[PDB]
Amino acid sequence: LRHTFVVADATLPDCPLVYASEGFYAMTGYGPDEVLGHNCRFLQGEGTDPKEVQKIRDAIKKGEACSVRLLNYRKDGTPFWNLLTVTPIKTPDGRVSKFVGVQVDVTS
Ligand SMILES: Cc1cc2nc3c(=O)[nH]c(=O)nc-3n(C[C@H](O)[C@H](O)[C@H](O)COP(=O)(O)O)c2cc1C
């Protein structure tokens, strides 16, 4: 329940984040001045499995929900495991307006 939440704008090509919960900032070490307006990929690094990343990339392309485990890094460079679940939010016309994401640090 110590999960975090963010919102990405799907009307912009690179799904930049337009909102992040208090927790997301505190957990990652990053502040709004460095996350808002940017694609969430900045949390990835050397150990991030490119196959899981591809999985999210493809789901977003198709406007579908996706859940994957990714190794992410805090602002100080330290690693942590993030169980990410992305959900598309559509307008009545069927087009995708936003992407919602729930991040859970499952490092245990
Ligand atoms: C709403 C939302 C939240 C995301 N949260 C994270 C995250 O916490 N960590 C991460 O590594 N990637 C996260 N992503 C994945 C990247 O933002 C991006 O969708 C993905 O890496 C696409 O592949 P690409 O970087 O190869 O273009 C999120 C994506 C969306 C749409």
Tab-separated table of C-alpha atoms and ligand atoms in Angstrom:
chain	number	residue	atom	x	y	z
A	1	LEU	CA	0.000	0.000	0.000
A	2	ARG	CA	3.076	2.175	-0.071
A	3	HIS	CA	2.579	2.276	-3.821
A	4	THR	CA	2.878	5.405	-5.933
A	5	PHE	CA	0.792	6.868	-8.749
A	6	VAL	CA	1.489	8.959	-11.845
A	7	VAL	CA	-0.368	10.184	-14.900
A	8	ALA	CA	1.050	10.420	-18.413
A	9	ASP	CA	-0.429	12.573	-21.173
A	10	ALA	CA	-1.104	10.348	-24.176
A	11	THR	CA	-2.071	13.351	-26.314
A	12	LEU	CA	1.619	14.204	-26.468
A	13	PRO	CA	3.801	11.803	-28.527
A	14	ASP	CA	6.223	10.703	-25.785
A	15	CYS	CA	3.688	10.224	-22.959
A	16	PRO	CA	5.226	12.784	-20.614
A	17	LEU	CA	4.195	12.731	-16.959
A	18	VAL	CA	1.773	15.519	-15.980
A	19	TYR	CA	1.173	14.358	-12.415
A	20	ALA	CA	2.878	12.238	-9.759
A	21	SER	CA	1.769	11.391	-6.227
A	22	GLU	CA	3.664	12.600	-3.154
A	23	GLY	CA	4.988	9.057	-2.805
A	24	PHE	CA	6.466	8.823	-6.310
A	25	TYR	CA	8.689	11.841	-5.638
A	26	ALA	CA	9.717	10.722	-2.143
A	27	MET	CA	10.488	7.169	-3.271
A	28	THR	CA	12.460	8.026	-6.440
A	29	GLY	CA	14.329	10.979	-4.962
A	30	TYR	CA	13.224	13.219	-7.845
A	31	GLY	CA	11.179	16.407	-7.502
A	32	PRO	CA	8.482	17.790	-9.846
A	33	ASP	CA	10.981	20.180	-11.453
A	34	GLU	CA	12.717	17.174	-12.882
A	35	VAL	CA	9.903	14.732	-13.645
A	36	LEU	CA	6.919	16.738	-14.949
A	37	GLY	CA	6.975	16.997	-18.735
A	38	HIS	CA	9.209	13.947	-19.062
A	39	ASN	CA	8.684	10.340	-20.081
A	40	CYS	CA	9.077	8.067	-17.077
A	41	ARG	CA	11.970	6.168	-18.705
A	42	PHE	CA	14.467	8.309	-16.780
A	43	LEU	CA	14.041	5.820	-13.907
A	44	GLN	CA	15.637	3.049	-15.981
A	45	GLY	CA	19.312	2.126	-16.076
A	46	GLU	CA	21.967	-0.512	-16.747
A	47	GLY	CA	20.162	-3.508	-15.264
A	48	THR	CA	16.742	-2.748	-16.740
A	49	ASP	CA	15.528	-5.692	-18.795
A	50	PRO	CA	15.019	-4.346	-22.341
A	51	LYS	CA	12.455	-7.096	-22.960
A	52	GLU	CA	10.145	-5.821	-20.219
A	53	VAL	CA	10.618	-2.272	-21.484
A	54	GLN	CA	9.648	-3.423	-24.980
A	55	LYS	CA	6.554	-5.027	-23.467
A	56	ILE	CA	5.390	-1.677	-22.055
A	57	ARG	CA	6.340	0.163	-25.233
A	58	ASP	CA	4.170	-2.169	-27.297
A	59	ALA	CA	1.176	-2.025	-24.959
A	60	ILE	CA	1.236	1.782	-25.042
A	61	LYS	CA	1.448	1.707	-28.856
A	62	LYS	CA	-1.682	-0.461	-28.972
A	63	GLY	CA	-3.371	1.504	-26.205
A	64	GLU	CA	-3.591	-1.508	-23.895
A	65	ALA	CA	-2.990	-2.206	-20.200
A	66	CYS	CA	0.281	-3.823	-19.150
A	67	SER	CA	1.990	-5.029	-15.998
A	68	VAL	CA	5.736	-5.653	-15.707
A	69	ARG	CA	8.657	-5.814	-13.252
A	70	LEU	CA	11.452	-3.337	-13.910
A	71	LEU	CA	14.688	-2.496	-12.190
A	72	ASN	CA	14.691	1.264	-11.603
A	73	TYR	CA	17.166	3.637	-9.982
A	74	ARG	CA	16.613	6.435	-7.488
A	75	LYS	CA	18.135	9.874	-8.099
A	76	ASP	CA	21.144	8.817	-6.001
A	77	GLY	CA	21.758	5.903	-8.360
A	78	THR	CA	20.653	3.171	-5.965
A	79	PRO	CA	18.584	0.323	-7.475
A	80	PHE	CA	15.120	-0.935	-6.635
A	81	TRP	CA	12.528	-3.245	-8.103
A	82	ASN	CA	9.381	-1.653	-9.433
A	83	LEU	CA	6.231	-3.625	-10.229
A	84	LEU	CA	4.548	-1.310	-12.725
A	85	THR	CA	0.973	-1.503	-13.977
A	86	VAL	CA	-0.021	0.844	-16.811
A	87	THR	CA	-3.674	1.557	-17.638
A	88	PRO	CA	-4.997	3.464	-20.679
A	89	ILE	CA	-7.767	6.028	-20.103
A	90	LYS	CA	-9.906	6.628	-23.188
A	91	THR	CA	-12.378	9.304	-24.227
A	92	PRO	CA	-15.897	8.247	-25.255
A	93	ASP	CA	-14.728	8.209	-28.888
A	94	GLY	CA	-12.338	5.397	-28.009
A	95	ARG	CA	-9.084	7.352	-28.300
A	96	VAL	CA	-6.502	7.182	-25.503
A	97	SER	CA	-6.159	10.448	-23.607
A	98	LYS	CA	-4.010	9.476	-20.637
A	99	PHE	CA	-2.011	6.604	-19.245
A	100	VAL	CA	-2.160	5.864	-15.558
A	101	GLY	CA	0.552	4.017	-13.707
A	102	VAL	CA	0.725	2.341	-10.324
A	103	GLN	CA	4.270	1.674	-9.088
A	104	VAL	CA	5.025	-0.678	-6.218
A	105	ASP	CA	8.549	-1.072	-4.830
A	106	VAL	CA	8.747	-4.847	-4.434
A	107	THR	CA	12.419	-5.071	-3.450
A	108	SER	CA	11.235	-6.600	-0.151
B	1	LIG	C1	1.658	5.974	-16.814
B	1	LIG	C2	3.086	5.389	-16.963
B	1	LIG	C3	3.941	5.160	-15.895
B	1	LIG	C4	5.279	4.612	-16.087
B	1	LIG	N1	6.083	4.407	-14.987
B	1	LIG	C5	7.291	3.915	-15.153
B	1	LIG	C6	8.176	3.684	-14.010
B	1	LIG	O1	7.825	3.938	-12.839
B	1	LIG	N2	9.420	3.172	-14.290
B	1	LIG	C7	9.898	2.852	-15.617
B	1	LIG	O2	10.997	2.425	-15.680
B	1	LIG	N3	9.086	3.051	-16.676
B	1	LIG	C8	7.843	3.556	-16.497
B	1	LIG	N4	7.024	3.753	-17.592
B	1	LIG	C9	7.615	3.337	-18.918
B	1	LIG	C10	8.183	4.483	-19.753
B	1	LIG	O3	7.565	5.723	-19.421
B	1	LIG	C11	7.954	4.207	-21.255
B	1	LIG	O4	6.497	4.001	-21.429
B	1	LIG	C12	8.526	2.928	-21.796
B	1	LIG	O5	9.907	2.700	-21.428
B	1	LIG	C13	8.391	2.941	-23.321
B	1	LIG	O6	9.520	2.399	-23.995
B	1	LIG	P1	10.708	3.273	-24.533
B	1	LIG	O7	11.377	3.950	-23.357
B	1	LIG	O8	11.610	2.216	-25.191
B	1	LIG	O9	10.125	4.317	-25.501
B	1	LIG	C14	5.699	4.293	-17.476
B	1	LIG	C15	4.805	4.533	-18.569
B	1	LIG	C16	3.529	5.070	-18.350
B	1	LIG	C17	2.634	5.309	-19.553
